[PDB]
Write a protein that binds this ligand. Structure first.
Ligand code: BCL
Ligand code: BCL
Ligand code: BCL
Ligand code: BCL
Ligand code: BCL
Ligand code: BCL
Ligand code: BCL
Ligand code: BCL
Ligand code: BCL
Ligand SMILES: COC(C)(C)C/C=C/C(C)=C/C=C/C(C)=C/C=C/C(C)=C/C=C/C=C(C)/C=C/C=C(C)/C=C/C=C(C)/C=C/CC(C)(C)OC
Ligand SMILES: [Ca+2]
Ligand SMILES: [Ca+2]
Lengths: 40, 53, 53, 53, 42, 53, 40, 52, 53, 40, 40, 52, 42, 53, 42, 52, 40, 53, 41, 52, 53, 40, 53, 53, 40, 40, 40, 42
């Protein structure tokens, strides 16, 4: 890919932060959907 | 392991992000359509009231 | 992070905006067609009055 | 922002105008066809007077 | 830049584009007002 | 604006004229067919007198 | 397009005049059509 | 008054060919459209019915 | 007009004659097809007499 | 197109004359068709 | 097309006379067809 | 009287080939068209029926 | 000329073409006379 | 005319012969098929005697 | 000469072609005479 | 008497190949045509039906 | 992409502003639609 | 004639043999299917004894 | 044209005529047998 | 113990891409298969029916 | 003849063997399928006993 | 084909011998088939 | 024999492993689909209890 | 003969092995398809017991 | 592939660790599904 | 094909021997099949 | 393939060991499946 | 040779091929014996 090592570290940090934020949003949305219309 | 950050020395970041975005959008559409067909439908279920009447 | 502004050093802005515009237009059309077929229709629901009679 | 006028340093004006014109014409045709099929039709609603009788 | 336009040309094109888009929107608004006065849908 | 005459330094006049002519002819045919399909027909409406009789 | 400024100005003048004539003809035609079969 | 410059933009030969082709196609289309209505002149038993 | 003979300095005579011949033959065939399917048919109208009897 | 200005003027004159003759023929034919089978 | 002016004149003369002969034959044929089976 | 110059524009060989092909196709087409009317000469039991 | 034929060759070809076309038309006319004598259609 | 033998200075003899042979064979097949479907059939007409029965 | 044949070759080919065509037409005529003798159609 | 020159125009090899192929195809076609008429020799129960 | 760092900063600022304006417009439109025709 | 052995100076022996073999195999298969289809079938004729029963 | 000389044409014509006549004789005999078996005309 | 040499034959990145794609497709397929049996969790009126 | 061994100076042995093997396998499959559909079937004939029942 | 004359003679001899053997086998097979199931 | 390890001097190991993996996965899917259609199905057989009730 | 080992100087061993393994796998699948459809089926024959009772 | 030996060792270690984590997650999910809806 | 004379002779010998063995196997198989299910 | 002889020996050893492990796993799985639902 | 193999390589490959083919046939025979002991078909 041509990326160096420090660039890999920075990209990994930002990628993990964004993925965790996205997962938190999904979890909140599913909590609301369960509070509205339980399915299980 | 703690040296997982080397995964970006094998996989190109740009194509990874593009594939993630496209796959997530397609999955969202597909899951919404699948849920719409069951009895969990929220549009055509006459709640709170019926509007075509 | 606070260094998110580097996302444009990987993704080309012009294609990003073109894709966003096209996707949003297609999504708007798709959601309107989906909503029309349900009981939330606003055209063929005889409100306020019926014009074909 | 106040520096939005730089959007033409990324998007080519000619193709932008051509796409806008084509999309607007297609949208106008599509909306007219959609509205014609509902009960808001203005042609085949016998107003003011029925002409085939 | 990418398109090749300068900065003054960008300013002029933005001004004219904004004026034309606003005129188009005004015409659409007037037409929709007339259509609502004829055949209310909502 | 008063500098609207510069639109021909972006759009080629010849293709603009050809596209305008073609689009207008196609629109005229389409609208005549659409009007023929409804009850505003002027040919097969027995006015001023039926001829196949 | 390769056009100069004077050519663009002349083309704009002629284009505007022709489009206005075409619109006047269309308006007269719809006036006659409304006088024959009112649709609205 | 300066409309004669329209031939400095549009090539005359293609203009004439397109005009001829379009006029022929339009004539055919309008004759077929009129034939299918009650304005038909062939199968309308005037002056006399010939098959019978 | 008196200067109408210059039309052959724009249109190639050979293609003009070939197109005229082909179009006239096709038009003759088409008009015969159209006329044969009406009550002006001259073959299957039992005049002077019926031969399949 | 490569045409000069005098050629453009001559072509415009002949084109307009031919178009007017064609329109005259069309209106005569339509007058005859109206005298035979009125449609409006 | 490469044609000269005299060739254009000659071709126009022959084309016109041939077209007129063809139209005369068509007119005679239509006269006969009307004398046999009137359609209008 | 100068009609013989028509062969200085049209190629003689292709003209002959086109005439031959068109005439053959026209002969076939007209024979098939006539065969399907009441002018048929084969299936009209004249001078006598052979299958029966 | 475009076809490459000279003037005398064109004249000879025109003469032979006319002769053959007239013979073909004469045969067609005779055949149609016989067909009319057999099965009148008009 | 008496100079008809020059027809072979325009038409290539080999192609003429091949086309003649192919056309004659195809025409023979076509005419033998056309006659078979009429009442002039010679195979299935029980003359001189029926063989299946 | 487009086909590349001399005048004498054209003459000889025309003679042989005419003779063969006449023989073929004679055979066809005899066959049609026999067919008419067997199964008249007109 | 000079008919032997036909091989100076037509290539013998292709002539023989075409003759062989055409004759084989014609033989197949005529046998199929005859089989479907009342001259069939297989399914005509002569001299005796075998599946009976 | 070839963009420098200051260009990236400016583009991010304008992109964020435009996306927030678009989201505000969508939120207002959905508020009006809920006030008219409640679906949940 | 007695000089028929020159037929191999025109026809290539290898292709002749390949064509003969292929044609004979195809003909054998085709004649076998044709004979099976007719009344001379030897398999499904219950001779000498009826199996499947 | 095809490359054959003037004597090769004569030899080929002789052999072709002989073979065609033999083939036609075989066809005639076969049709005679078929006529004695199944008269069709 | 020398199994780690398997990466001297197989390209790591293609292996990872194939694994990811295959696992996603398998997950979708197995969810489709289960959805069509009596183990369905959506249209089984538990805990309560909502279209009523 | 005693000089038949020269047939390999015309036909290439490798292709001959490959064609023989392929043709024999295809013929074996075809003949087994043909025999299976007649009353000589050995699988579904209830001999020596029916297993489904 | 490039074959000489002696090669043509040899190939003709072998071809004729093989064709005659094939025809003899076919004749014997048809005799047996006629002795089993007469068809004519 | 004991010299079977030379089989990798003819067959390339990489393609061998790829083909083995692909064939095993396809066979697993095929056998699962085949078994699911018989009376050995484990999903839609109401064991231990029926859930759609 | 005793010199059969020379058959590998004509046929390439690698393609021979690939063809053998592919043909054997295809044959195994085909024979299982054929056998499963007859009355020798082992899956759907209610032996030892019926599970979808 | 061009990889060295130490790189192969490191990649194998990380691959095994990730595969084991994925399998543990799958096992936990299947345990939860079994406590919810037993199929066997 | 490029084969010499001795190679052709050896190939012919082996080919004949193998074809005869194959035909013997076929004959035995049809003998057994006739002893099981006589078709003729 | 380009492989040497020692590499062939090593690959054969590892391939055989892995194939035997896979077969053992398949055998255990089939034993469990037979203990659940006998098919023969 | 066409394949490029020498004579000793041909002999070795023939020996190994025959051994493997015989082992495969033995396994097939045992499997068919078991299948006959379960469900006789002939
Ligand atoms: C009641 C009707 C009679 C009958 C009436 C007649 C009459 C009448 C005739 C025949 C004739 C024939 N009949 Mg019979 N025939 C009957 C029933 C049959 C049956 C059957 C199973 O019922 C068969 C198999 C035949 C077969 C035959 C052939 C021997 C012969 C046609 C051969 C041919 O066309 O020449 C083909 C000519 C060639 C020159 C071919 C040369 C061969 C070449 C070398 C082959 C090379 C292959 C080539 C290149 C193609 C390549 C193919 C591709 C590679 C795939 N008949 C019934 C019993 N039959 C005809 C005949 O006997 O002619 C002598 C004939 O006139
Ligand atoms: C009873 C069922 C509920 C419902 C249950 C759920 C559940 C559960 C979820 C959603 C989620 C979503 N729903 Mg919902 N949803 C319902 C009805 C709708 C209606 C409608 C017209 O009926 C629409 C248009 C939507 C649309 C949406 C999207 C906002 C979102 C999926 C986006 C996506 O796939 O990101 C994929 C795109 C990317 C990964 C690209 C990267 C991110 C980009 C740049 C921005 C994406 C926009 C972002 C998701 C907006 C979130 C803001 C708020 C959470 C709304 N839902 C009904 C009312 N919906 C999901 C969600 O909220 O995710 C946070 C989700 O988990
Ligand atoms: C009850 C429903 C009403 C009706 C309700 C509306 C409403 C509401 C609207 C229209 C609009 C339009 N209607 Mg309306 N309309 C009706 C029935 C018709 C019929 C018909 C045969 O029945 C026709 C041919 C039309 C045609 C039109 C067009 C003039 C216009 C769409 C053009 C476009 O898409 O621009 C897209 C093209 C471009 C962007 C290209 C750039 C501009 C070019 C150079 C010029 C465009 C022509 C311009 C629109 C002309 C304006 C004419 C006047 C508005 C009359 N309507 C009926 C009677 N109609 C729209 C409109 O008026 O826009 C101003 C609109 O908002
Ligand atoms: C009850 C309904 C009326 C009717 C209502 C209308 C209305 C309303 C209109 C027309 C218009 C037209 N009608 Mg009308 N029309 C009717 C039935 C017909 C019939 C028929 C056989 O029944 C035909 C053939 C026509 C044909 C026409 C065309 C002359 C014209 C559309 C041309 C175009 O699209 O220009 C597009 C082409 C270009 C832009 C190319 C550029 C210009 C070229 C070089 C010249 C074009 C010729 C010009 C249009 C001729 C106009 C002169 C007169 C107005 C006739 N109408 C019935 C009787 N019709 C339109 C019109 O008159 O436009 C002025 C129009 O607005
Ligand atoms: C009740 C209805 C009437 C009828 C009503 C009309 C009306 C109205 C019109 C026609 C016109 C035409 N009709 Mg009318 N027509 C009827 C039935 C027919 C029948 C038929 C078999 O029934 C045929 C074959 C025709 C044919 C024709 C053509 C002569 C002409 C259209 C040609 C064209 O498209 O020009 C396009 C071609 C070009 C632009 C190429 C250039 C012109 C060339 C070089 C010159 C050729 C002659 C030209 C077409 C002039 C025609 C006049 C003739 C001498 C009569 N009509 C019936 C009897 N018809 C039109 C017409 O007359 O135009 C003047 C017209 O307006
Ligand atoms: C009731 C109607 C009559 C009938 C009425 C007519 C009439 C009328 C005509 C024909 C003509 C023809 N008919 Mg007739 N015909 C009938 C039944 C048949 C049957 C049949 C099996 O029933 C056949 C095979 C034919 C065949 C023929 C052809 C000889 C000829 C068309 C050839 C052509 O298109 O030349 C086109 C080919 C070329 C131009 C190529 C150049 C010339 C070549 C080199 C030689 C051609 C041979 C020449 C046409 C033969 C004519 C001699 C005699 C008239 C037989 N007719 C029925 C019985 N037929 C036409 C004709 O006789 O033309 C002279 C014609 O006018
Ligand atoms: C009641 C109807 C009669 C019948 C009525 C006629 C009439 C009428 C004619 C034929 C003619 C033919 N018929 Mg017959 N015919 C009948 C049924 C058949 C049957 C069948 C299975 O029933 C067959 C196979 C044929 C076959 C034939 C061909 C011999 C010939 C057409 C060949 C051709 O197109 O030449 C085109 C081929 C070439 C130009 C290539 C060159 C010719 C080669 C070099 C020589 C080959 C022999 C040649 C065809 C001449 C045949 C000799 C004898 C006349 C048989 N007829 C029935 C019994 N038939 C035509 C004919 O006899 O022509 C002479 C013809 O006029
Ligand atoms: C009632 C009908 C009988 C039956 C009657 C016959 C008769 C008769 C014959 C066969 C023959 C065969 N049968 Mg059985 N057969 C029956 C049912 C079956 C069933 C089944 C599932 O029901 C199968 C799988 C077979 C399969 C076979 C093959 C072993 C063989 C065809 C192979 C081939 O085409 O070689 C072609 C392949 C090549 C030429 C490639 C070259 C040689 C290769 C290297 C080795 C091939 C293996 C060889 C065939 C082994 C044969 C040894 C024993 C005879 C088994 N039979 C039933 C029980 N079967 C044929 C045979 O035995 O041939 C010897 C044969 O003649
Ligand atoms: C009543 C019918 C019997 C049955 C009767 C038979 C008979 C008879 C035979 C088989 C054979 C096979 N059967 Mg079974 N079989 C039944 C039902 C099944 C079912 C199932 C889900 O119902 C499956 C998956 C199988 C699968 C199998 C394979 C193991 C084998 C075919 C493999 C092949 O094509 O070789 C091709 C293989 C290769 C090309 C790979 C080369 C060798 C490799 C390296 C070694 C891998 C193992 C190999 C497949 C050997 C298999 C032996 C196993 C240890 C059991 N059978 C039922 C129970 N089955 C055949 C067999 O056992 O062959 C020995 C066989 O003769
Ligand atoms: C270069 O190398 C160096 C030097 C670096 C050393 C390194 C070497 C290394 C690291 C090597 C690693 C090797 C590995 C990991 C190898 C793994 C191999 C495996 C797992 C092999 C497995 C093989 C399994 C086989 C071949 C199974 C075959 C089964 C068959 C053919 C079954 C067929 C069944 C059928 C057709 C059934 C049909 C019946 C049904 C019922 C389906 O019909 C309807
Ligand atoms: Ca008549
Ligand atoms: Ca019989």
């Amino acid at each position: 890919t041509g990326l160096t090592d420090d660039e890999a570290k920075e990209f990994h940090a930002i990628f993990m932060q964004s993925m965790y934020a996205w997962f938190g949003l999904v979890v909140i949305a599913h909590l609301l959907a369960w509070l509205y219309r339980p399915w299980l | 392991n703690a040296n997982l950050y080397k995964i970006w020395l094998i996989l190109d970041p740009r194509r990874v992000l593009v594939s993630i975005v496209a796959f997530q959008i397609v999955l969202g559409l597909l899951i919404h359509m699948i849920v719409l067909s069951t009895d969990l439908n929220w549009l055509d279920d006459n709640i709170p009231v019926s509007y075509q009447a």
